[PDB]
Amino acid sequence: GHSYEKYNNWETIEAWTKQVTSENPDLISRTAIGTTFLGNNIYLLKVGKPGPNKPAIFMDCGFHAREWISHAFCQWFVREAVLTYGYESHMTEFLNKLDFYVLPVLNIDGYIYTWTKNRMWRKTRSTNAGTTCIGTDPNRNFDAGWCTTGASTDPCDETYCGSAAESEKETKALADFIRNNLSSIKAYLTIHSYSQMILYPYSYDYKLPENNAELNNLAKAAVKELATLYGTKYTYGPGATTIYPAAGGSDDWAYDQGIKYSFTFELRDKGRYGFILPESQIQATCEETMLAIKYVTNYVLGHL
């Protein structure tokens, strides 16, 4: 049984994507953009009032298996969009004017594994020749300064960058989809935990975006909206120096594809529970994160 206030396993999440789609056929369609190393379907939800050539925002969760509040949020978001459509002015405008592409869980095989075997697992669950070490890091596997810094060429490492960029069926599937929908996608948002931050490019080098001032202003105003609920303090800035150098990330890659608004979110907390954020903080985390996402969304409306 599914709950938005608890963490769901992949069976429950899969069943939910099918169920939430069938009940909101007017606001949600559902596809699979590919399969994982183990053969699981990577589901994508398109949320919005259908219409001709609508611009889109793309958000994914569950890059990293152990970061459960991530997966929890994509689900919370989807329910917020469909429950509040027509009743809350801003989301009503949002869904009429654009589409949200929500990818609930990218790294499905890893996420299963954190339920079955190792709650602290991070990487995919693909094999590597010549070793029993399992997994590539999805967020070192994109073609953005690939494996030049902040990434390991050791398969046993937590940031193993893979045998080549897009070696993972999962990262290939996501890149392929983005690359084929470049004309419509205006923002890219990728949800991780933890740290309470909003990051923008770059991490594969120490240069800043061409619209550096704009993204800085935007992040600053987003973390302000988020604080308004419970006073939760987020910080923000470029990835390389706000967290660490790390090439091959999807935010840098999407940006260099030409998506001008490209952010990595780190949700709660600051380490007191870390990846094991208790279920009793899901709702409050998700509620405050919504205000940040919606603020960014409204701004992007200015550029359609």
Ligand X SMILES: N=C(N)Nc1cccc([C@H](OP(=O)(O)[C@@H](NC(=O)OCc2ccccc2)C2CCCCC2)C(=O)O)c1
* Per-residue b or e along 124-139, where b marks 16 or more CB atoms closer than 10 Å to that residue's CB: bbbebeeeeebbbbbb
Note the helical H segments in 35-136: 68-84, 89-97, 108-116
Task: For residue 252, state whether it binds ligand X (rule: CB under 6 A).
Answer: yes
Residue 243 contacts ligand X per CB under 6 A:
yes
Please select the residue that binds ligand X; options are 239, 269, 286, 288, rule is CB under 6 A. Answer: 239
Instruction: Specify whether the CB–CB gap between 31 and 43 falls below 8 A.
Output: yes
**Taking the complex as a whole, how short is the minimal distance between the CB of residue 136 and ligand X, in angstroms?**
12
- Regarding 264 and contact with ligand X (CB under 6 A), the answer is yes
In 10 A of CB 220, how many CB atoms?
14
Spatial distance between the Cα atoms of 139 and 193, rounded to a whole number of angstroms: 13
Question: Is 65 a known ligand-binding residue?
Answer: yes
- Residue type present at position 39: G
If contact means CB under 5 to 8 A according to the sort of partner, which of ligand X, Zn ion, none does residue 159 touch? ligand X
Q: Specify which residues 188 forms β-bridges with.
A: 58, 262
Can you tell me which of 125, 192, 268, 294 binds ligand X, judged by CB under 6 A? Answer: 192
The residue (of 101 and 194) whose beta carbon lies closer to ligand X is 194
- Altogether, the residues listed in the chain come to a count of 304
Q: Which of 243, 153, 163 is nearest to 198 (CA)?
A: 243
Q: Which window, 22-30, 100-108, 160-168, 188-196, contacts Zn ion (CB under 5 A)? A: 188-196
Contacts of ligand X in 203-222 (CB under 6 A) = 203
How far apart are the C-alpha atoms of 85 and 110, rounded to whole Å?
A: 33
Q: Is 60 in the site for ligand X (CB under 6 A)?
A: no
Element (DSSP H or E) covering residue 189: strand 185-192
Answer for which of 100, 113, 194, 255 binds ligand X (CB under 6 A) is 194
Q: Out of 249, 254, 290, 294, point to the residue binding ligand X (CB under 6 A).
A: 249
Give the pair of three-digit tokens for residue 169.
């069926």
140 binds Zn ion (CB under 5 A): no
Interaction between residue 266 and ligand X (CB under 6 A): yes
266 catalytic? Reply is yes
Residue ranges in 127-186 that form contacts with ligand X under rule CB under 6 A = 139, 158-159
Choosing from 7, 47, 64, 285, the residue that interacts with Zn ion (CB under 5 A) is 64
Q: For residue 298, with 0-12 CB atoms within 10 Å meaning exposed, 13-18 middle and 19 or more buried, which class applies?
A: middle
| 264 versus 285: smaller Cβ distance to ligand X | 264
Applying CB under 5 A, the span of 10-18, 46-54, 184-192, 231-239 interacting with Zn ion comes to: 184-192
Interaction between residue 71 and Zn ion (CB under 5 A): no
Q: Does 192 bind Zn ion (CB under 5 A)?
A: yes
Residue 185: strand pairing partners: 56
Q: Which residues neighbour 146 within 8 Å (Cβ) at sequence distance 6 or greater? A: 140, 161, 164, 165, 204, 247, 248
Q: Which residues are catalytic?
A: 266
Q: Give contact residues for ligand X (rule: CB under 6 A).
A: 64, 139, 158-159, 192, 194-195, 199, 203, 239, 243, 246, 249, 251-252, 264, 266
Residues that bind Zn ion (CB under 5 A): 64, 192
